[PDB]
Amino acid sequence: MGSSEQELKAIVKDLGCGPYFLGTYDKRFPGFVSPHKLACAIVNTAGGVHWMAFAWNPRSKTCYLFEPFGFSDQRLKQVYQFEYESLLRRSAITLEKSTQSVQGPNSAACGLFCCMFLHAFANWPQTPMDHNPTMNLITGVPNSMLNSPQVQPTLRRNQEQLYSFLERHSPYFRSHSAQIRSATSFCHLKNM
Ligand code: NA
């Protein structure tokens, strides 16, 4: 179920993020960011779901945290606010976090959505969250309504947009398309 670190690494490389990508991390951010270089990373917040994306723009001095569930989990939000502050202390500034949900609650596509955000960051680091060709494919919904029936079609359309984007941009995804689709499916966690 979900996506492995090696899957995500292969897709991020296909998407052209390699020059800025620091790796995949277990629970913690990367050790440091540099005042001189764009950087991004994927963090497993649990230690094949629980994926969040990190990015850093040294020119705007902005850290981005992309979370498909809009930081609707208050403990997760608290943890990573502190991680941000600690990262700045190790590195010697603004944090922009997701505020709306783009993924269905029964989906296991978290890691894939993080890859899509990293494409957006690598290409439009001045505006990675929204108002760019990649993220404009995806629509956020209010967190309080994440579990409401009426938003599920929007969250499903987001996932369809995600898969179609990956088919166009990632040879790895094409080579593993049916497998990854099955493992990450929109209702992987609901069978009613
Ligand atoms: Na969008």
Coordinates of C-alpha atoms and ligand atoms in Angstrom, one line a residue:
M1 CA 0.0 0.0 0.0
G2 CA 1.2 3.5 -0.7
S3 CA 4.6 4.3 -2.1
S4 CA 8.1 3.4 -1.0
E5 CA 11.0 5.7 -0.6
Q6 CA 12.7 4.2 -3.6
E7 CA 9.6 4.7 -5.8
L8 CA 9.4 8.3 -4.8
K9 CA 13.1 8.9 -5.4
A10 CA 12.8 7.4 -8.9
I11 CA 9.9 9.7 -9.7
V12 CA 11.5 12.8 -8.3
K13 CA 14.5 12.1 -10.5
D14 CA 12.3 11.7 -13.5
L15 CA 10.6 15.0 -12.7
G16 CA 13.8 16.9 -12.9
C17 CA 14.2 17.7 -9.2
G18 CA 17.5 15.9 -8.8
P19 CA 19.8 19.0 -8.6
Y20 CA 17.9 20.3 -5.6
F21 CA 16.7 17.1 -3.9
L22 CA 18.3 16.3 -0.6
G23 CA 16.7 12.9 -0.1
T24 CA 14.0 11.2 1.8
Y25 CA 13.9 11.6 5.6
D26 CA 12.4 9.7 8.5
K27 CA 10.4 12.0 10.7
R28 CA 13.0 14.8 10.9
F29 CA 13.9 17.4 8.4
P30 CA 17.2 17.6 6.6
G31 CA 20.2 18.7 8.6
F32 CA 20.5 22.1 7.0
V33 CA 19.6 24.4 4.2
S34 CA 22.1 26.7 2.6
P35 CA 21.7 30.4 2.0
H36 CA 23.0 29.8 -1.4
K37 CA 21.0 26.9 -2.9
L38 CA 17.4 25.8 -3.7
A39 CA 16.6 22.6 -1.8
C40 CA 13.8 20.1 -1.4
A41 CA 13.1 16.8 0.3
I42 CA 10.4 14.3 1.1
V43 CA 9.7 13.4 4.7
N44 CA 8.0 10.3 6.0
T45 CA 6.2 11.6 9.1
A46 CA 5.6 8.2 10.6
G47 CA 9.0 6.6 10.3
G48 CA 3.9 3.7 2.5
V49 CA 1.8 6.6 3.5
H50 CA 2.5 9.5 5.7
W51 CA 4.5 11.6 3.2
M52 CA 5.1 15.4 3.2
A53 CA 7.2 17.6 1.0
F54 CA 9.7 20.2 2.1
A55 CA 11.3 23.0 0.0
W56 CA 13.5 26.0 0.5
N57 CA 14.0 29.1 -1.6
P58 CA 17.1 31.1 -0.4
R59 CA 16.3 34.1 -2.5
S60 CA 12.8 34.7 -1.0
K61 CA 14.0 33.1 2.2
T62 CA 10.8 30.9 2.3
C63 CA 10.5 27.3 3.5
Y64 CA 7.5 25.4 2.0
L65 CA 5.7 22.5 3.6
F66 CA 3.3 20.7 1.3
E67 CA 1.0 18.3 3.1
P68 CA -1.9 16.7 1.1
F69 CA -4.2 16.9 4.1
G70 CA -3.7 20.6 4.6
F71 CA -2.1 20.2 8.1
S72 CA -5.6 19.3 9.3
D73 CA -3.8 17.0 11.8
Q74 CA -2.9 19.5 14.6
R75 CA -0.2 17.4 16.1
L76 CA 1.5 16.9 12.7
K77 CA 1.3 20.7 12.2
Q78 CA 2.8 21.4 15.6
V79 CA 5.7 18.9 15.1
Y80 CA 6.7 20.4 11.8
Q81 CA 6.4 23.9 12.9
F82 CA 9.1 23.0 15.5
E83 CA 11.1 21.1 12.9
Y84 CA 11.2 24.3 10.7
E85 CA 12.4 26.3 13.6
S86 CA 15.1 23.8 14.5
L87 CA 16.2 23.6 10.9
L88 CA 16.8 27.4 10.9
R89 CA 18.8 27.1 14.1
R90 CA 21.1 24.4 12.5
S91 CA 21.4 26.4 9.3
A92 CA 22.8 29.7 10.7
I93 CA 12.4 34.0 6.9
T94 CA 8.9 32.7 6.2
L95 CA 7.3 29.3 6.4
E96 CA 4.4 28.6 4.0
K97 CA 2.4 25.6 4.8
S98 CA -0.5 23.8 3.0
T99 CA -3.9 25.0 4.4
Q100 CA -6.3 23.0 2.3
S101 CA -6.6 19.3 1.4
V102 CA -6.0 17.9 -2.1
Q103 CA -6.1 14.2 -1.3
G104 CA -9.1 12.0 -0.4
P105 CA -9.1 10.5 3.1
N106 CA -9.2 7.0 1.7
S107 CA -6.4 7.5 -0.8
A108 CA -2.9 6.2 -0.5
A109 CA -1.4 8.7 -3.0
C110 CA 0.3 10.9 -0.6
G111 CA 3.8 10.3 -1.8
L112 CA 2.8 10.9 -5.4
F113 CA 1.2 14.2 -4.6
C114 CA 4.5 15.2 -2.9
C115 CA 6.4 14.4 -6.1
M116 CA 4.0 16.5 -8.1
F117 CA 4.5 19.4 -5.7
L118 CA 8.3 19.0 -6.0
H119 CA 8.0 19.3 -9.8
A120 CA 6.1 22.6 -9.2
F121 CA 8.9 23.8 -6.8
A122 CA 11.8 22.8 -9.1
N123 CA 10.2 24.7 -12.0
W124 CA 8.5 27.7 -10.2
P125 CA 10.3 28.0 -6.8
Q126 CA 9.0 31.6 -6.5
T127 CA 5.4 30.3 -6.5
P128 CA 5.3 26.5 -5.9
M129 CA 2.2 26.0 -3.9
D130 CA -0.4 27.6 -6.3
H131 CA -0.5 29.8 -9.4
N132 CA 1.7 27.5 -11.5
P133 CA 1.0 25.1 -14.3
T134 CA 1.5 21.9 -12.2
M135 CA -0.4 22.9 -9.1
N136 CA -3.2 24.5 -11.1
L137 CA -4.2 21.0 -12.1
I138 CA -5.2 20.3 -8.4
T139 CA -8.0 21.9 -6.4
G140 CA -7.9 22.3 -2.6
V141 CA -10.9 21.7 -0.4
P142 CA -11.5 23.0 3.1
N143 CA -10.1 20.7 5.8
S144 CA -13.3 20.7 7.9
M145 CA -15.0 19.1 4.9
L146 CA -12.4 16.5 4.1
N147 CA -14.7 13.7 4.9
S148 CA -17.8 15.2 3.4
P149 CA -19.4 13.2 0.5
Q150 CA -19.7 16.3 -1.7
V151 CA -15.9 16.9 -2.0
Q152 CA -15.0 13.4 -2.9
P153 CA -15.4 13.9 -6.7
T154 CA -13.0 16.9 -6.5
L155 CA -10.4 14.9 -4.6
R156 CA -10.8 12.0 -7.0
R157 CA -10.3 14.4 -10.0
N158 CA -7.1 15.6 -8.3
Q159 CA -5.9 12.0 -8.2
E160 CA -6.8 11.4 -11.8
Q161 CA -4.9 14.6 -12.7
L162 CA -1.9 13.4 -10.7
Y163 CA -1.8 10.0 -12.5
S164 CA -2.2 11.6 -15.9
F165 CA 0.6 14.1 -15.1
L166 CA 2.9 11.3 -14.0
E167 CA 2.2 9.3 -17.1
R168 CA 3.4 12.2 -19.2
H169 CA 6.4 13.1 -17.1
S170 CA 7.8 9.9 -15.6
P171 CA 9.1 6.8 -17.5
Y172 CA 9.4 5.1 -14.1
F173 CA 5.7 5.7 -13.4
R174 CA 4.7 4.4 -16.9
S175 CA 6.9 1.3 -16.3
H176 CA 5.0 0.6 -13.1
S177 CA 1.7 2.3 -13.9
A178 CA -0.9 -0.3 -13.0
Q179 CA 1.1 -1.4 -9.9
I180 CA 1.4 2.1 -8.5
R181 CA -2.2 2.9 -9.3
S182 CA -3.4 -0.1 -7.4
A183 CA -1.2 0.5 -4.4
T184 CA -2.1 4.2 -4.2
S185 CA -5.7 4.1 -5.2
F186 CA -8.3 6.7 -4.3
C187 CA -10.4 4.4 -2.2
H188 CA -7.6 2.1 -1.1
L189 CA -8.8 2.5 2.5
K190 CA -12.7 2.4 1.9
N191 CA -14.6 -0.6 0.6
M192 CA -18.2 0.7 0.9
Ligands
NA1 NA -4.1 24.3 -7.3

